[PDB]
Amino acid sequence: GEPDSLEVLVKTLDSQTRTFIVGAQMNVKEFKEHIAASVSIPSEKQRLIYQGRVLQDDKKLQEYNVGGKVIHLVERAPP
């Protein structure tokens, strides 16, 4: 039946893409924590980018309509 999960592709600057399947209401901060082990970047050092814009920690992934899409991941010092 109806999806309660999203497919989210994360592509790092080495051009590796990894796919994650996560809860449809998960937020950006939770997502960074989720992918941290696989991408080898602590959540506080992750910058996620989609359609030219940096994803905000307090927003829900669904607010960016990222289901089935490639998000870019960049490693940067925490602000």
Swiss-Prot record:
Domain Ubiquitin-like: 6-79
Posttranslational modification: Ricin can induce a cleavage by the caspase CASP3. The released C-terminal peptide induces apoptosis. (Microbial infection) In case of infection by L.pneumophila, ubiquitinated by the SCF(LegU1) complex.
Bilayer-spanning residue ranges: none
Tissue expression from the record: Expressed by immature dendritic cells (at protein level).
Annotated localization: Cytoplasm, Cytosol; Nucleus; Secreted, Extracellular exosome
Disulfide bond annotation, renumbered to this chain: none
Subunit structure: Component of the BAG6/BAT3 complex, also named BAT3 complex, at least composed of BAG6, UBL4A and GET4/TRC35. Interacts with GET4; the interaction is direct and localizes BAG6 in the cytosol. Interacts with UBL4A; the interaction is direct and required for UBL4A protein stability. Interacts with AIFM1. Interacts with HSPA2. Interacts with CTCFL. Interacts with p300/EP300. Interacts (via ubiquitin-like domain) with RNF126; required for BAG6-dependent ubiquitination of proteins mislocalized to the cytosol.
Entry domain remark: The ubiquitin-like domain mediates interaction with the E3 ubiquitin-protein ligase RNF126 which is responsible for the BAG6-dependent ubiquitination of client proteins. SGTA also binds this domain and competes with RNF126 to antagonize client protein ubiquitination and degradation. The ubiquitin-like domain also mediates the interaction with USP13.
Record function comment: ATP-independent molecular chaperone preventing the aggregation of misfolded and hydrophobic patches-containing proteins. Functions as part of a cytosolic protein quality control complex, the BAG6/BAT3 complex, which maintains these client proteins in a soluble state and participates in their proper delivery to the endoplasmic reticulum or alternatively can promote their sorting to the proteasome where they undergo degradation. The BAG6/BAT3 complex is involved in the post-translational delivery of tail-anchored/type II transmembrane proteins to the endoplasmic reticulum membrane.
Protein name: Large proline-rich protein BAG6
Organism: Homo sapiens
